[PDB]
Design an enzyme around this catalytic site. Sequence first.
Site, PDB file in Angstrom:
ATOM      1  CG  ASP A   1       8.476   0.259 -24.475  1.00 25.41           C
ATOM      2  OD1 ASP A   1       8.545  -0.583 -25.393  1.00 25.41           O
ATOM      3  OD2 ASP A   1       8.449   1.494 -24.673  1.00 25.41           O
TER       4      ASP A   1
ATOM      5  CD  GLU B   1      11.509  -2.875 -26.743  1.00 25.19           C
ATOM      6  OE1 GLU B   1      11.632  -2.919 -27.989  1.00 25.19           O
ATOM      7  OE2 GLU B   1      10.884  -1.966 -26.151  1.00 25.19           O
TER       8      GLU B   1
HETATM    9  O1  LIG Z   1      11.600   8.764 -32.591  1.00 29.64           O
HETATM   10  C1  LIG Z   1      12.136   7.447 -32.549  1.00 29.64           C
HETATM   11  C2  LIG Z   1      11.494   6.563 -33.601  1.00 29.64           C
HETATM   12  O2  LIG Z   1      10.119   6.363 -33.197  1.00 29.64           O
HETATM   13  C3  LIG Z   1       9.344   5.562 -34.089  1.00 29.64           C
HETATM   14  O3  LIG Z   1       9.865   4.271 -34.229  1.00 29.64           O
HETATM   15  C4  LIG Z   1       9.081   3.217 -33.641  1.00 29.64           C
HETATM   16  C5  LIG Z   1       8.984   2.054 -34.639  1.00 29.64           C
HETATM   17  O4  LIG Z   1       8.207   2.454 -35.759  1.00 29.64           O
HETATM   18  C6  LIG Z   1       8.352   0.822 -33.985  1.00 29.64           C
HETATM   19  O5  LIG Z   1       8.395  -0.274 -34.889  1.00 29.64           O
HETATM   20  C7  LIG Z   1       9.119   0.461 -32.714  1.00 29.64           C
HETATM   21  O6  LIG Z   1      10.422   0.082 -33.060  1.00 29.64           O
HETATM   22  C8  LIG Z   1      10.937  -1.115 -32.446  1.00 29.64           C
HETATM   23  C9  LIG Z   1      11.332  -2.097 -33.550  1.00 29.64           C
HETATM   24  O7  LIG Z   1      10.172  -2.484 -34.273  1.00 29.64           O
HETATM   25  C10 LIG Z   1      12.016  -3.333 -32.961  1.00 29.64           C
HETATM   26  O8  LIG Z   1      12.491  -4.155 -34.014  1.00 29.64           O
HETATM   27  C11 LIG Z   1      13.180  -2.935 -32.035  1.00 29.64           C
HETATM   28  O9  LIG Z   1      14.286  -2.489 -32.776  1.00 29.64           O
HETATM   29  C12 LIG Z   1      15.544  -3.060 -32.348  1.00 29.64           C
HETATM   30  C13 LIG Z   1      15.857  -4.309 -33.161  1.00 29.64           C
HETATM   31  O10 LIG Z   1      14.804  -5.249 -33.029  1.00 29.64           O
HETATM   32  C14 LIG Z   1      17.167  -4.918 -32.660  1.00 29.64           C
HETATM   33  O11 LIG Z   1      17.495  -6.058 -33.448  1.00 29.64           O
HETATM   34  C15 LIG Z   1      18.298  -3.878 -32.746  1.00 29.64           C
HETATM   35  O12 LIG Z   1      18.575  -3.580 -34.073  1.00 29.64           O
HETATM   36  O13 LIG Z   1      17.935  -2.657 -32.063  1.00 29.64           O
HETATM   37  C16 LIG Z   1      16.697  -2.072 -32.541  1.00 29.64           C
HETATM   38  C17 LIG Z   1      16.504  -0.765 -31.799  1.00 29.64           C
HETATM   39  O14 LIG Z   1      17.617   0.095 -31.993  1.00 29.64           O
HETATM   40  O15 LIG Z   1      12.747  -1.984 -31.063  1.00 29.64           O
HETATM   41  C18 LIG Z   1      12.176  -0.778 -31.613  1.00 29.64           C
HETATM   42  C19 LIG Z   1      11.885   0.152 -30.453  1.00 29.64           C
HETATM   43  O16 LIG Z   1      11.987   1.509 -30.853  1.00 29.64           O
HETATM   44  O17 LIG Z   1       9.105   1.570 -31.818  1.00 29.64           O
HETATM   45  C20 LIG Z   1       9.744   2.765 -32.329  1.00 29.64           C
HETATM   46  C21 LIG Z   1       9.647   3.820 -31.244  1.00 29.64           C
HETATM   47  O18 LIG Z   1      10.739   3.728 -30.341  1.00 29.64           O
HETATM   48  C22 LIG Z   1       9.276   6.231 -35.461  1.00 29.64           C
HETATM   49  O19 LIG Z   1       8.533   5.410 -36.352  1.00 29.64           O
HETATM   50  C23 LIG Z   1      10.693   6.431 -36.004  1.00 29.64           C
HETATM   51  O20 LIG Z   1      10.638   7.148 -37.229  1.00 29.64           O
HETATM   52  C24 LIG Z   1      11.558   7.200 -34.999  1.00 29.64           C
HETATM   53  O21 LIG Z   1      12.906   7.207 -35.451  1.00 29.64           O
HETATM   54  O1  LIG Z   2       4.325  13.552 -29.748  1.00 34.45           O
HETATM   55  C1  LIG Z   2       5.531  14.098 -30.262  1.00 34.45           C
HETATM   56  C2  LIG Z   2       6.194  13.138 -31.227  1.00 34.45           C
HETATM   57  O2  LIG Z   2       5.237  12.858 -32.279  1.00 34.45           O
HETATM   58  C3  LIG Z   2       5.697  11.937 -33.266  1.00 34.45           C
HETATM   59  O3  LIG Z   2       5.983  10.681 -32.718  1.00 34.45           O
HETATM   60  C4  LIG Z   2       5.113   9.618 -33.145  1.00 34.45           C
HETATM   61  C5  LIG Z   2       5.938   8.538 -33.842  1.00 34.45           C
HETATM   62  O4  LIG Z   2       6.516   9.071 -35.027  1.00 34.45           O
HETATM   63  C6  LIG Z   2       5.064   7.337 -34.197  1.00 34.45           C
HETATM   64  O5  LIG Z   2       5.894   6.294 -34.687  1.00 34.45           O
HETATM   65  C7  LIG Z   2       4.272   6.839 -32.972  1.00 34.45           C
HETATM   66  O6  LIG Z   2       5.118   6.172 -32.078  1.00 34.45           O
HETATM   67  C8  LIG Z   2       4.607   4.906 -31.611  1.00 34.45           C
HETATM   68  C9  LIG Z   2       5.224   3.774 -32.428  1.00 34.45           C
HETATM   69  O7  LIG Z   2       4.866   3.932 -33.797  1.00 34.45           O
HETATM   70  C10 LIG Z   2       4.729   2.419 -31.910  1.00 34.45           C
HETATM   71  O8  LIG Z   2       5.396   1.374 -32.599  1.00 34.45           O
HETATM   72  C11 LIG Z   2       5.021   2.289 -30.412  1.00 34.45           C
HETATM   73  O9  LIG Z   2       6.400   2.130 -30.232  1.00 34.45           O
HETATM   74  C12 LIG Z   2       6.841   1.404 -29.063  1.00 34.45           C
HETATM   75  C13 LIG Z   2       6.998  -0.090 -29.387  1.00 34.45           C
HETATM   76  O10 LIG Z   2       5.750  -0.655 -29.762  1.00 34.45           O
HETATM   77  C14 LIG Z   2       7.539  -0.801 -28.150  1.00 34.45           C
HETATM   78  O11 LIG Z   2       7.665  -2.196 -28.384  1.00 34.45           O
HETATM   79  C15 LIG Z   2       8.897  -0.202 -27.808  1.00 34.45           C
HETATM   80  O12 LIG Z   2       9.761  -0.332 -28.879  1.00 34.45           O
HETATM   81  O13 LIG Z   2       8.747   1.195 -27.510  1.00 34.45           O
HETATM   82  C16 LIG Z   2       8.191   1.974 -28.600  1.00 34.45           C
HETATM   83  C17 LIG Z   2       8.018   3.377 -28.067  1.00 34.45           C
HETATM   84  O14 LIG Z   2       7.258   3.359 -26.869  1.00 34.45           O
HETATM   85  O15 LIG Z   2       4.479   3.404 -29.690  1.00 34.45           O
HETATM   86  C18 LIG Z   2       4.934   4.708 -30.126  1.00 34.45           C
HETATM   87  C19 LIG Z   2       4.260   5.743 -29.234  1.00 34.45           C
HETATM   88  O16 LIG Z   2       2.841   5.708 -29.364  1.00 34.45           O
HETATM   89  O17 LIG Z   2       3.563   7.913 -32.356  1.00 34.45           O
HETATM   90  C20 LIG Z   2       4.395   9.016 -31.933  1.00 34.45           C
HETATM   91  C21 LIG Z   2       3.495  10.015 -31.231  1.00 34.45           C
HETATM   92  O18 LIG Z   2       2.542  10.565 -32.130  1.00 34.45           O
HETATM   93  C22 LIG Z   2       6.948  12.490 -33.950  1.00 34.45           C
HETATM   94  O19 LIG Z   2       7.426  11.556 -34.906  1.00 34.45           O
HETATM   95  C23 LIG Z   2       8.029  12.754 -32.903  1.00 34.45           C
HETATM   96  O20 LIG Z   2       9.166  13.336 -33.522  1.00 34.45           O
HETATM   97  C24 LIG Z   2       7.493  13.695 -31.824  1.00 34.45           C
HETATM   98  O21 LIG Z   2       8.467  13.836 -30.801  1.00 34.45           O
END
Ligand SMILES: OC[C@H]1O[C@H](O[C@H]2[C@H](O)[C@@H](O)[C@@H](O[C@H]3[C@H](O)[C@@H](O)[C@@H](O[C@H]4[C@H](O)[C@@H](O)[C@@H](O)O[C@@H]4CO)O[C@@H]3CO)O[C@@H]2CO)[C@H](O)[C@@H](O)[C@@H]1O
Ligand SMILES: OC[C@H]1O[C@H](O[C@H]2[C@H](O)[C@@H](O)[C@@H](O[C@H]3[C@H](O)[C@@H](O)[C@@H](O[C@H]4[C@H](O)[C@@H](O)[C@@H](O)O[C@@H]4CO)O[C@@H]3CO)O[C@@H]2CO)[C@H](O)[C@@H](O)[C@@H]1O
Length: 1052
Positions: A646, A675
């Site tokens: 991840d 990723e």
């Molecule tokens: O604090 C960091 C952010 O954390 C939270 O974001 C989440 C998203 O809600 C999840 O959907 C997921 O994000 C994935 C994303 O869905 C996936 O598409 C991919 O993004 C890539 C993209 O596919 C690729 O084409 C290119 O553009 O690069 C992108 C990444 O830069 O991977 C994402 C992984 O992050 O997980 C994140 C957590 O990391 C929260 O909702 C946000 O507000 C916050 O900024």
């Molecule tokens: O705990 C302190 C932090 O709390 C808050 O963070 C939130 C995010 O805002 C939420 O988006 C969520 O994060 C999820 C995310 O939504 C979910 O998609 C998943 O993301 C993965 C993704 O599936 C995977 O494919 C890859 O892209 O990596 C991503 C990150 O691992 O999992 C996330 C973690 O559960 O929940 C967190 C925690 O409550 C707040 O926004 C932050 O600023 C703060 O630091």
Amino acid sequence: DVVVRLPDVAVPGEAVQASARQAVIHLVDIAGITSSTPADYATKNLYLWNNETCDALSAPVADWNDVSTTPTGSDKYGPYWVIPLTKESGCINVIVRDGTNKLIDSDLRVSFSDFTDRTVSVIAGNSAVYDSRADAFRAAFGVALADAHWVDKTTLLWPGGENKPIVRLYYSHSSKVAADSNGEFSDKYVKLTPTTVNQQVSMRFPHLASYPAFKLPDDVNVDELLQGETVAIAAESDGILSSATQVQTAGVLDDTYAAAAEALSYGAQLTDSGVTFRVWAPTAQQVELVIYSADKKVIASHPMTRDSASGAWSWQGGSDLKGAFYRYAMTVYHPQSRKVEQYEVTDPYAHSLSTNSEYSQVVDLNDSALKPEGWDGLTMPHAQKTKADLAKMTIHESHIRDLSAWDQTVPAELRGKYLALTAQESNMVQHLKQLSASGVTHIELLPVFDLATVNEFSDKVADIQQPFSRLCEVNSAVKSSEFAGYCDSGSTVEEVLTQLKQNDSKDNPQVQALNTLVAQTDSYNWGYDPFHYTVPEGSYATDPEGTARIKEFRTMIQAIKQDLGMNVIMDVVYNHTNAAGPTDRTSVLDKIVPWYYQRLNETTGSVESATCCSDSAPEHRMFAKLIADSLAVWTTDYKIDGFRFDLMLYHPKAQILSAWERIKALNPDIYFFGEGWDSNQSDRFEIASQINLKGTGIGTFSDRLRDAVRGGGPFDSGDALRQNQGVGSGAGVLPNELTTLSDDQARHLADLTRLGMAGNLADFVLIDKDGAVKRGSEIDYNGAPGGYAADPTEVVNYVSKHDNQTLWDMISYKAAQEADLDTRVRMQAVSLATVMLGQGIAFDQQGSELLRSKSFTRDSYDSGDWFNRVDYSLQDNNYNVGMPRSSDDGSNYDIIARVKDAVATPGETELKQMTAFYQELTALRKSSPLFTLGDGATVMKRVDFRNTGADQQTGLLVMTIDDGMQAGASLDSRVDGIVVAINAAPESRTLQDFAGTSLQLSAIQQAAGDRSLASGVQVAADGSVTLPAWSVAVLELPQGESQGAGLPVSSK
Ligand SMILES: OC[C@H]1O[C@H](O[C@H]2[C@H](O)[C@@H](O)[C@@H](O[C@H]3[C@H](O)[C@@H](O)[C@@H](O[C@H]4[C@H](O)[C@@H](O)[C@@H](O)O[C@@H]4CO)O[C@@H]3CO)O[C@@H]2CO)[C@H](O)[C@@H](O)[C@@H]1O
Ligand SMILES: OC[C@H]1O[C@H](O[C@H]2[C@H](O)[C@@H](O)[C@@H](O[C@H]3[C@H](O)[C@@H](O)[C@@H](O[C@H]4[C@H](O)[C@@H](O)[C@@H](O)O[C@@H]4CO)O[C@@H]3CO)O[C@@H]2CO)[C@H](O)[C@@H](O)[C@@H]1O
Ligand SMILES: OC[C@H]1O[C@H](O[C@H]2[C@H](O)[C@@H](O)[C@@H](O)O[C@@H]2CO)[C@H](O)[C@@H](O)[C@@H]1O
Ligand SMILES: [Ca+2]
Ligand SMILES: [Ca+2]
Ligand SMILES: [Ca+2]
Ligand SMILES: [Ca+2]
Ligand SMILES: [Ca+2]
């Protein structure tokens, strides 16, 4: 050596002293050294009011809108207020403002006992009360931030010491460094001198290479200073302090202890002959091993033995400690709190845990009692040795609850558990068995290591299949909500949610309103929240107390490989921890070695959250070791076949490769992928991205074909979700009412799709939309070179995944109104065909074969069983079961309401139809070695495309794979070549490219008859081939006595 002190002469005096029955407040605001006129403070005012705590205010003006309480006067040091009091005792409530806005947020209480003369001073954005304008002025000259970095034995990088006569490193073993009552710093220190950063430190931390460098004496006792707090202080030649900040010590920790520590093994290492506990804690002042009985009572507390060279602590005991629970009692300084903390912490190298991870447990994973019958002889059903072996990888991304939470044919006690995979008679297992028999080769598991976001104590959890009364008893938010009336009803949560569906809409999203509360205390979460990296998750076991989960996890692995015939891939999340700091229940690593395992901001010392949560530091030696050691256990002890990293991009390229080198020694055929996006960490180290990993053998998900086929991108919202159609949903050829995509734009997506079907290679040569000859790296993908890989095995293609909207939901957002239900099912199959029939590794979301929907939810990680439901009884695809979570999809409610009911919701007929299409595609993928060549050079020598250029028929993808004399040896004895034709369009298309070639339809598709994706395809006598709308045909050139001419790649 002059003593360092705070400013004492060039400090502001008092504007005025409070007289009888009155208070005075100063707002320290010094004008510029060039100022020439009294500053304007007409808008400056105060909001006075007296309550229970303070009532000393005399006739306090009410109404927040009143700004008449302006300054009584002002001088060069700021304005001041003379407040009329009712008495000279007690206190007063005050809030400094600049009109209507707050200069200081927090409410201010001026205690007349704390400040006898009732004359105080405050500063903008401070919120603290001072006895004089001088004290307040000095407040800016205290310990702040943490922008000083002790990177190695004698190097300190700190901007604040530049051009400063006095630069020192103060230290206190058990106390906080701060000026005494005399305004002096009496604490001990060591002198620093300007120096030049060495190449060593420069290479280790490129991002700090431009910081002013300072040299510590060679005789410095680093070990002792690291035992407590250290503060970098700078002052003028006269001893007046200029600044002071905290110190980040990760660098010097690695330089001092890393090598010695790396040579040791950690955790509770149990053998039949004894046990040795070891934990790395180089800065701890004391560490005791606390042993607990089964009932969690302290049996003994053992002071551990510290190893000077490594900074590790150990304790050796007898084999009778097998199964004992334990924790490490730490006495260690934590920079975030600035105090010597005292707390018990679980083992970061734990291999067994008690319920909810409260205590670690001593275990020997080799024990036969923790292994299912025949475990040691478990073989991998699919080979992963050669690139050709790897290319056959066809992944089914699954989740433990998504698989069985809704299957009534799975025994009730196994629903949502690892053991559900052993229920051979269930709809779910039988379904997976058939997918395997049809070509799915690997099961990828979402987080099955110990996650933190699900309470493992069953009495603290309530799920939707249980009474609403249970939900209310365990969730106080529900009991105090608008749903409280259901608490004493006789319905289950599921029954209530079902009844809320009819009246649910964008104007009343009641289903998600209730579900959002349910999510707080249910058994559901994707689990990307690491608590312990090398112990199986407890909630997925029937008994989360102790070692039981270990054998159950293994039983599941054995069932998948042996009885379902599929390899297993584990999702790992080493890029971040669930939490950090000295107080959070789930902070493990950051409590034992503060500020070492997390990546911190260079100026503030705050733990970064770019990953979402508590960013880790894989670039630090001991964390890289923890990761490699952890992977070793999953590989050897749990027989995992591959790992999906991840956010691999937050890891250094060198670290991932080193880990692979170490794991290949245990399992030579292990596969690594993840990723590889842009983590923005390139300033610190070379990242493990798609680009940088070219030719390394480490795979990365490709977002190229993914977006070209699905349409749009992951950042789309509102109408863009419908406008951005993909090749799979009719871009150009079957436009909806909102899109403005041009033919050129649609053909560009086709270029990206073809490139992807050929493995997204940087050097693959094709003819683009304009008829130009282009290498894969020349096809643009939103500003970046499209093709990036050396071999197709470095590319993982997909059109659906746990993240973002499901393929079906995307097709529902994008399909033209006139595209009927049957057409949409074919669009789903056509979209998947680009992945399954391509050269890159094939990856797909659990349920795509069942048209899986999440009711439009984009990020369903905490959306529970309701929105993540997969019905193996085949009644529906979970579409239209309520508006998705408003917090993240609320902005899409309008477009959802407009497209949602275009056609009927899939039923058993459509689901069976899709499963047939899906298994046909996977069966075709493995029907010939030509579909999975593995080697990039071989792909370039055999794969080509037809229907390209400016005169192409939009949406028609025609790929050829040569096995003729010009390609080399015949890899398939049955054919001289293969033709893959995907007609993603509403028109019938006729191919004339193979006239007089004797082309035949694949036996597999022929066998499916009118249930085939090739139903209606016709191969005429003239050799022409006609394809119906939204069809997929795999044709072949039968091989005669000798290898034939085949389909040679055209010279370009
Ligand atoms: O604090 C960091 C952010 O954390 C939270 O974001 C989440 C998203 O809600 C999840 O959907 C997921 O994000 C994935 C994303 O869905 C996936 O598409 C991919 O993004 C890539 C993209 O596919 C690729 O084409 C290119 O553009 O690069 C992108 C990444 O830069 O991977 C994402 C992984 O992050 O997980 C994140 C957590 O990391 C929260 O909702 C946000 O507000 C916050 O900024
Ligand atoms: O705990 C302190 C932090 O709390 C808050 O963070 C939130 C995010 O805002 C939420 O988006 C969520 O994060 C999820 C995310 O939504 C979910 O998609 C998943 O993301 C993965 C993704 O599936 C995977 O494919 C890859 O892209 O990596 C991503 C990150 O691992 O999992 C996330 C973690 O559960 O929940 C967190 C925690 O409550 C707040 O926004 C932050 O600023 C703060 O630091
Ligand atoms: O009236 C007493 C009350 O004053 C303050 O409340 C302010 C609030 O801070 C403003 O943001 C805005 O809402 O106006 C309020 C007064 O109308 C204090 O914050 C509050 O503690 C205090 O009781
Ligand atoms: Ca005073
Ligand atoms: Ca857990
Ligand atoms: Ca949950
Ligand atoms: Ca950074
Ligand atoms: Ca052949």
